[PDB]
């Protein structure tokens, strides 16, 4: 979830992820989980508010342990009437050293134990006053879970209202730049090779430093390369920056720069500072 601060602008967070239908994720750093938020800027410039989030979660070890407890040794209420209600904390102290295999639990298997000890556990259960009506079930469940594999079905059926979700939070202050600009250029390509049908990118990014500059990269061309030299005319509106290119060439490296952070600056005109450099080669 995501929460908006007490300043209460017209921030419209349309992004709000609810994992209602899946109770599933994995974060083993092989694939990439990306969450994203489609927020809105304020009614005016607003650069420093505070955002705090709400991630409910669990960990998969007690997810499979809740599954193994609720459907491996305490499935019915008949065994839950006597055989485990007097040894529940002993069952938790036995379950905390299970150490199930979480390396093949993300590849076509779930609730599959590793090569942990199962020899002296019977002697440890026999050392106390554990009756055979529970010592048969607590041995047969570990013997079954020593080699078994489940699926993604009937996982939420055990996970439903049987996990304390640690609703953690963080802090994201929505960082901002320093030097606002607003420019728009226009090009006219004197063709070396006739046209290479280039793909465009009208950038919007601002430089935030002192005694600095704004460096731009040209559009991307994908036919026969090394050619299509583009001429340009600036019309550098709403400022007085310094330009450092004239009639470049759209091959391997042109880098039509514009020295910006020297004179005639402004304040933070938006959420961050902006430079919405929209080229238009028509």
């Amino acid at each position: 979830e995501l929460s908006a601060p007490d300043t209460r602008n017209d921030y419209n967070i349309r992004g709000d992820y609810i994992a209602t239908t899946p109770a599933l994720i994995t974060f083993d750093g092989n694939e990439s989980f990306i969450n994203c938020y489609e927020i809105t800027a304020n009614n005016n410039f607003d650069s420093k508010d505070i955002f705090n989030l709400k991630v409910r979660y669990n960990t998969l070890k007690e997810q499979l342990d809740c599954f193994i407890t609720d459907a491996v040794l305490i499935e019915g209420d008949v065994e839950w009437f006597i055989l485990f209600e007097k040894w529940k904390t002993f069952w938790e102290l036995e379950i905390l050293k299970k150490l199930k295999y979480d390396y093949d639990a993300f590849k076509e298997n779930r609730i599959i134990r590793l090569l942990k000890t199962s020899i002296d556990l019977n002697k440890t259960k026999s050392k106390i006053r554990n009756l055979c009506i529970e010592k048969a079930v607590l041995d047969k469940i570990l013997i079954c879970l020593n080699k078994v594999s489940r699926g993604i079905a009937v996982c939420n059926t055990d996970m439903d209202e049987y996990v304390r979700n640690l609703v953690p939070k963080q802090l994201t202050v929505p960082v901002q730049l320093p030097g606002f600009e607003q420019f728009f250029h226009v090009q006219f390509e004197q063709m070396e090779t006739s046209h290479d049908a280039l793909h465009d990118t009208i950038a919007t990014i601002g430089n935030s430093l002192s005694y600095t500059v704004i460096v731009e990269n040209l559009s991307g061309q994908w036919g026969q390369d090394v050619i299509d030299d583009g001429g340009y005319i600036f019309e550098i509106l709403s400022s007085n920056e310094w330009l450092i290119h004239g009639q470049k060439r759209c091959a391997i490296k042109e880098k039509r720069k514009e020295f910006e952070v020297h004179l005639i600056p402004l304040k933070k005109g938006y959420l961050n500072f902006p430079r919405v450099e929209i080229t238009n080669i028509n």
Partner: protein, 251 residues
């Protein structure tokens, strides 16, 4: 020592080497004149470039630019002008000369006068399909770039062979997927997919008999630069000549 100049030369495939000169006001000269100008309270300079030209050879000919150029004047800037030289098949390296005229106008209409002239050699710092065995060459006589819709069209091969046995070769397109990092795996799959069913040859398994007209029809839209499906097999001493030539957009 007021505007550092460099020239970059590139080799276009259309038999015209393009050389572009770039001029930029050097930063050491900028601070050098800038502190003495800001002593008299000046922030932006005025170097008026009023006559910039490039000359060719021992007889001086003025090769023009690729576009227009006025008489401009600015400070703390850089500008590049590109001329089109002629591609040389021999080892004669052309030596050209360039010249400029920077009018370093100090204020209240009290201007200095500077001129500069460099001269150096325009070096470049270092298709027809030919086989590996014999004299057999391939080239498409029709222009390899062509603009078609998804309709029927034609294309024209040409063979220059040893005149001893000009025949005994066959063409075919091989409309099947080549049998292949999941991202690079699926990128190579998309390349091998759109190769194998993008255009289809309307006469494959085709015995050749110095022209050879072969006719396609194009199905799927996109630019097929070096369309490499079609594969001319040589019958005797069984090997394969790839034809990595031709590029048809289908829009």
């Amino acid at each position: 020592l007021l505007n550092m100049r460099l020239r970059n030369i590139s080799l276009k495939s259309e038999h015209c080497i393009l050389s572009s000169l770039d001029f930029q006001t050097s930063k050491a000269s900028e601070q050098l004149t800038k502190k003495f100008i800001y002593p008299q309270e000046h922030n932006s300079f005025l170097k008026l470039n009023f006559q910039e030209i490039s000359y060719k050879l021992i007889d001086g000919t003025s090769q023009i630019e690729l576009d227009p150029i006025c008489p401009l004047k600015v400070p703390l800037t850089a500008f590049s002008y590109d001329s089109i030289s002629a591609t040389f098949k021999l080892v004669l390296l052309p030596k050209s000369t360039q010249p400029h005229r920077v009018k370093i106008t100090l204020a209240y209409e009290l201007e200095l006068h500077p001129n500069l002239k460099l001269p150096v050699r325009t070096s470049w710092e270092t298709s027809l399909v030919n086989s590996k065995l014999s004299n057999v060459k391939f080239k498409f006589i029709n222009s390899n770039i062509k603009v078609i819709k998804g309709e029927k069209f034609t294309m024209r091969l040409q063979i220059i062979n040893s005149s001893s046995s000009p025949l005994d070769l066959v063409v075919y397109y091989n409309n099947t997927i080549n049998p292949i990092t999941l991202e690079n795996q699926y990128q190579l799959h998309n390349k091998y997919r759109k190769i194998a069913e993008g255009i289809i040859l309307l006469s494959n398994d085709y015995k050749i008999p110095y022209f050879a007209d072969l006719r396609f029809i194009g199905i799927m839209s996109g630019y097929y630069g070096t369309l490499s499906g079609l594969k001319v097999l040589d019958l005797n001493t069984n090997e394969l000549i790839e034809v990595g030539n031709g590029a048809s957009v289908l829009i």
